Write a protein that binds this ligand. Sequence first.
Ligand SMILES: [Cu+2]
Ligand SMILES: [Cu+2]
Ligand SMILES: [Zn+2]
Ligand SMILES: [Zn+2]
Lengths: 151, 151
Amino acid sequence: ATKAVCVLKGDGPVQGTIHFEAKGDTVVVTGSITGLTEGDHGFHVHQFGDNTQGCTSAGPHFNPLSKKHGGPKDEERHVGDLGNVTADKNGVAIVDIVDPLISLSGEYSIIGRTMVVHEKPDDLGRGGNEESTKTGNAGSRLACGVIGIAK
Amino acid sequence: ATKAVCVLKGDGPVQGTIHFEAKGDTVVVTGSITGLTEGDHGFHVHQFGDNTQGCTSAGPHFNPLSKKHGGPKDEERHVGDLGNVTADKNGVAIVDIVDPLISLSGEYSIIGRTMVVHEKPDDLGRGGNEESTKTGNAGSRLACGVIGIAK
Ligand SMILES: [Cu+2]
Ligand SMILES: [Cu+2]
Ligand SMILES: [Zn+2]
Ligand SMILES: [Zn+2]
């Protein structure tokens, strides 16, 4: 199972297509998100691929190792913690990420789970309040999609 | 996972929430679909969880064992062949299928793949032609969604 895709949709204008590819021992994340406000936006893999109640039903960040929230370069982070994507003034964010914790098969597989792009910047677990340790104070979910197997 | 869920969405009025629960070597499929025309509608699991082009990008019916299209009860069927769901006059179809072929884990898990509800009834590979043993002449794809892991 080597390629996956995720189409992000929400109640507003934010949309995007994210691609995942197993390369070597890692996973390459690419694609783009449009309709975003300029600046940073939290970008995470949530535990469930449940869109029955919008992006809400996706639950907390994918966290099989029971850790606290952090940035993608931290030792202490959720498997789903891919940090921030950055939208330019035109509202476009180009995604290009390589991540050591997610996978497309087995225990760390994100197939069947939800990709979410947030309203605000992820403070990488350094905000100082309890919320930072769970979600990075990234706020509401602007758009999401279930990660599916791609050809 | 022992539980999965799928939210069907299309370009028209059809929409639904489908539930999947593993039970023994079976998967119990339940839920409902609304906005359908009265009568039967093909209900299949397509290969890819790719929604980059509505339900078209989902690809063919999930068929890992390379067999011809049939109905759920047939030995010669595609794994994704779940048959027909029936809409009443109000166009609501209550889904209730117990299938021994689809699985929520292993080599031919349907998690990360696409659930598709069709325009026409599925003839179950008994329509008399060639389109009958590939799609069962179910027609266009009205609504679809990627099957995600549920809580
Ligand atoms: Cu998040
Ligand atoms: Cu079909
Ligand atoms: Zn997190
Ligand atoms: Zn089929």
